[PDB]
Structure 1
Amino acid sequence: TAGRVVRITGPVVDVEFPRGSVPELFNALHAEITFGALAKTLTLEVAQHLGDSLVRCISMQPTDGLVRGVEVTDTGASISVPVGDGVKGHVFNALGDCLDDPGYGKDFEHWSIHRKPPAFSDLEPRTEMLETGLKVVDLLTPYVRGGKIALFGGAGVGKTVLIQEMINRIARNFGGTSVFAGVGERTREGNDLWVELADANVLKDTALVFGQMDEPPGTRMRVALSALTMAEFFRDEQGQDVLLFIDNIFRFTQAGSEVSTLLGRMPSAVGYQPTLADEMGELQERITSTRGRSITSMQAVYVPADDYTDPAPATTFAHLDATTELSRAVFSKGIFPAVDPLASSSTILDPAIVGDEHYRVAQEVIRILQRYKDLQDIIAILGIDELSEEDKQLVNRARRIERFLSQNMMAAEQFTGQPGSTVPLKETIEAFDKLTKGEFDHLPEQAFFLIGGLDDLAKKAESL
């Protein structure tokens, strides 16, 4: 039978049930706020059993107006979200309730958002490259089809622009289906993405799930699993190739930290939940691709205080095949997509996979940029002039390599006005091979800003 709310601490609610009817973990409970201004059917999720039939639950809607003593009914099953080809082209919240038309999806097949990740026997590594048309990614951080990809960055470096750029590159011509999870991001960007996908006609092939900023930590941490359930349905049942964009996955751990401090759990190193690794792994080990059915995933990761040693990025690094670490220093130079060529990495940049022509060029570029980073001190104090001639030439071409990695992205059209460009992988390899050999050391350095190609590079060199 029904329970009784005993303790309310922000978005966390303790509910006492009878002796034997205590609900299971992750069960969905319902309470009612009856205050007229904001009355609603509150949804709670059982998180802990505290003894004496008490269970502590995480609220999905904000717990305002809730009164101690209100009856709480347990659905007997975890939070469920709709699944099927129907969810494509619609906008859902963390609880599976449709937004663009609220009557949608309550008759579809419903899947629990909590599941164990696929068995180890079904996993096999993905070593197929995914040409995105971006020089920096295609050269130094080659993405993996069916593999997890991360775009790390602080505030204002271009993570969201990159995510929508890769929606342009990958999703807009993708054969299968896509899913987008707005976790702790702006409702403004969610609406913008919705209209953009509607205009590009990619909406019909994508299911959008939003847990945006204005929502309490509960939904802000269960929205990722809600979207991942639809992705896993399209993976396991339909057999479709799946894309899964998640912006931003750090907000999942941040909401985890909030709920952890509210649940009474002792804080970890810098205030995060002690189970940061456990929860993060439970989420990102379900985003994996199995043997015969691929789920490409691209996750924007926020790096608080630009500190790349923060426990959340530190934990989420281990769950990635390709990592694109955007950096403030590159951003300040105007070198967009703003990737740090040295801090980024990919698990398929080995010569057995990308070829030795690609690998040799990438390693030479990384060597030049590492030498430039090492000389940064002398550059800062004295300048380029006091270096050795070898190092002076190396720096003069390192700056050009660094700027040539910039590209006029498609998504940049709304900001720069310039149209975007796509550079095929072969042209990128040839261009950077020429750059590392010194074949372009005479052109001015500005001829490389946001240029995207050898032919267009020659065009801009003629322009200057």
Structure 2
Amino acid sequence: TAGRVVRITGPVVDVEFPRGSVPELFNALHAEITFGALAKTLTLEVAQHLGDSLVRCISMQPTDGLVRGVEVTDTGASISVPVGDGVKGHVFNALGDCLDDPGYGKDFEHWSIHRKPPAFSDLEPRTEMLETGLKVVDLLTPYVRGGKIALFGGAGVGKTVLIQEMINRIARNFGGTSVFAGVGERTREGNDLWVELADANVLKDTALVFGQMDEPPGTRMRVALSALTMAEFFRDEQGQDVLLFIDNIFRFTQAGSEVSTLLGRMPSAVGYQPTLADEMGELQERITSTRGRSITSMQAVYVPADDYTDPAPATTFAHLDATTELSRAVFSKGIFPAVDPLASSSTILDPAIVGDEHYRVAQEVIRILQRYKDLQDIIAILGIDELSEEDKQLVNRARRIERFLSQNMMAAEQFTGQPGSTVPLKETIEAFDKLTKGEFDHLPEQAFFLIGGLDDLAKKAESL
């Protein structure tokens, strides 16, 4: 059994095999480069059959330096990755070989990266509420354990900052085993994350592996599968709750598009993959908390071109439960936690789960902001002189409540040079109800800018 390269173009390779033996789909193939300076061995994965014992395959290393006729050898197996107890505390590549300590490993168990979703009989819904020190997330869209978290927005809208903010909060509050991974992240932030993680003395239980831009897309859509396999391996055998962190899944989708363009298949809307929904569902349904296994994950998604008409995040919209969205205008206003209250929603908010006072407060805030937005069109030119006082008071209250949501998280310690703040939910709801009573109308608006709590509110207001 030997393989010969017949034609190559781009990262895609076509190979021909003898009649006697033809490996099945998703199998590792070995070839080498005979050039001196760029000496390297490469591995191909089975993509599709073309008849006459012709097989199409994809590379995860750059294809420069190849030459036709090179022998091709197979392993007769899919891609196996190492799994074990001592995995944590080390950085990993796409191949799974250790990066910090070369040669570390090759002595643990090996599992494939192609698995199947769990049976429906073991499925179970959850309602375990989760609380966070930030007031806005708790008041509007309270977090639920065992579910999925979505962070929607454009480009450069502070997604990363809130990501490490939440991860710091969770790490300080909660221990256990945790896994961070992602695709579409820069080297500098990764080194900074490593340094901060070492500072926190929690890197011993954290699993780290991720890709970069300057890589062939094969790694780009395989490292996420490797991370999910690690997550399932830790969840099943250990039977312990594991924190999962994934960032910038959008690149993933884009990666697929690229390879489809190389395949020659018929293009789709906006030049996308012929089939993307099925793979999206396969990726999403791999994450599921079992009855005996509580799993929490968060997802950072990138919206291309600041347009939501793209089906790229629209498809993901159908696989989420708790979503928080960001907008450019809110950032331009000045408040860093640029989270849209109008668009944001969650499926956990219900009077059956939470008391009626919280429901009433949320409904009142929603109606006030809706009325403010409705009047924004008229006020945009004429203003309040034409408008009545009955709506002028509403305008004032809306402005004050909008400015109050601003907060000073500790993650900005490297920018603002000030400590963060945290508030319990009871104080938050009490202060918000007091504000909605309108007692604070006498106070200036600017005092509400970047304040910690009602005590600090009063201190700042009376300081001027």
TM-score (norm 1): 0.94
Residue 175 and residue 439 in structure 1: after superposition, are their counterparts in 2 closer, same or farther (change >3 A)?
same
Structure 1 range deviating more: 452-461 or 290-299 = 452-461
Cα distance in structure 1, aligned partners of 2:46 and 2:303: 30
Taking structure 1 as reference, are residues 339 and 262 closer, same or farther at Cα in structure 2, changes over 3 Å only? same
| Alpha-carbon shift at residue 97 of structure 1 (Å) | 1.9
Aligned to 2:194: 194
Gaps of 5+ in 1: none
* 1:373-398: CA deviation from partner (whole Å, max 9, x where unpaired): 22222232233444333332222222
Cα distance per residue 1:249-306 (max 9 Å; x no partner) = 1111111111121222322211221222111111111122122211111111000111
2: CA distance between counterparts of 1:54 and 1:397? 70
Residue 133 and residue 23 in structure 1: after superposition, are their counterparts in 2 closer, same or farther (change >3 A)?
farther
Q: CA deviation at 1:372?
A: 2.0
SS at match of 2:396: helix
Q: Cα offset for 1:363? A: 2.2
CA distance in 1, matches of 2:20, 2:341: 58
* Residue ranges of structure 2 left out of the alignment (5+ in a row): none
In 1, distance between residues paired with 2:213 and 2:428? 38
Give deviations 1:334-356, integer Å, cap 9, x for gaps.
22221111222212112222332
1:165 positional shift: 1.0
- 1:182 Cα offset (Å): 2.2
| Maintained 8 Å contact 1:336/1:450 | no
CA offset at residue 46 of structure 1?
2.0
d(CA) in 2 for partners of 1:458 and 1:431? Answer: 12
Which secondary structure state, in structure 1, belongs to the residue aligned with residue 115 of structure 2? coil
**Secondary structure, aligned partner of 1:101:** coil
Q: Provide the rounded CA distance (Å) in 2 between the counterparts of 1:460 and 1:69.
A: 77
Deviations 1:196-218 (A, max 9, x none): 11111121121011112222211
- Give, in angstroms, the shift of residue 104 of structure 1: 2.2
The number of residue pairs the alignment matches comes to 464
- Please tell me the root mean square deviation across aligned C-alpha atoms, in Å: 1.9
Provide closer, same or farther for how the CA distance between residues 360 and 190 of structure 1 changes in structure 2, counting only shifts above 3 A: same
User: 1:29: how far off?
Assistant: 2.4
Greater alpha carbon shift after TM alignment, 122-131 vs 7-16: 7-16
CA change 1:101–1:439 in 2 (3 A) is farther
Cα deviation, residue 20, structure 1: 4.8
Corresponding residue SS for 1:194: helix
Cα deviation, residue 12, structure 1:
2.0
**Is the alpha carbon distance of 1:65 and 1:168 closer, same or farther for their aligned partners in structure 2, counting shifts above 3 Å?**
same
Distance in 2 between residues matched to 1:393 and 1:339, nearest whole Å = 24
Deviation at residue 42 of structure 1 after TM alignment: 1.9
Decide whether the 8 Å contact of 1:22 with 1:55 is kept in 2. Answer: no
With 155-164 and 88-97 compared, the bigger mean Cα shift is at 88-97
Deviations 1:138-169 (Å, cap 9, x if unpaired)?
11122221111011121100111111111011
Query: Do 1:148 and 1:288's aligned partners in 2 also have CA atoms closer than 8 Å?
Result: no
- Give the Cα–Cα distance (whole angstroms) in 1 for the partners of residues 383 and 34 of structure 2: 69
Whole-angstrom CA distance in 1 between matches of 2:376 and 2:326: 19
Q: Is the 8 A contact 1:168 1:410 kept in 2?
A: no
So what's the TM-score if we normalise by structure 2? 0.94
- Provide the identity percentage: 100
Cα distance in 1 for partners of 2:185, 2:269 equals 25
1:126-145 alignment runs, 5 A limit: 126-145=126-145
Give, in whole Å, the separation in 1 of the partners of 2:453 and 2:26. Answer: 52
Return 296-305 or 99-108, whichever deviates more.
Answer: 99-108
1:276 and 1:39 mapped to 2: Cα distance?
A: 36
Contact 1:289 1:296 in 2 (8 A): yes
Cα distance, 1:440–1:296 mapped onto 2, change above 3 Å? same
Pick closer, same or farther for the CA change 1:221–1:127 going to 2, 3 Å. same
Residue correspondence of structure 1 range 166-185 to structure 2 within 5 A: 166-185=166-185
**Structure 1 pair 443/189, CA: closer, same or farther in 2 (3 Å)?**
same
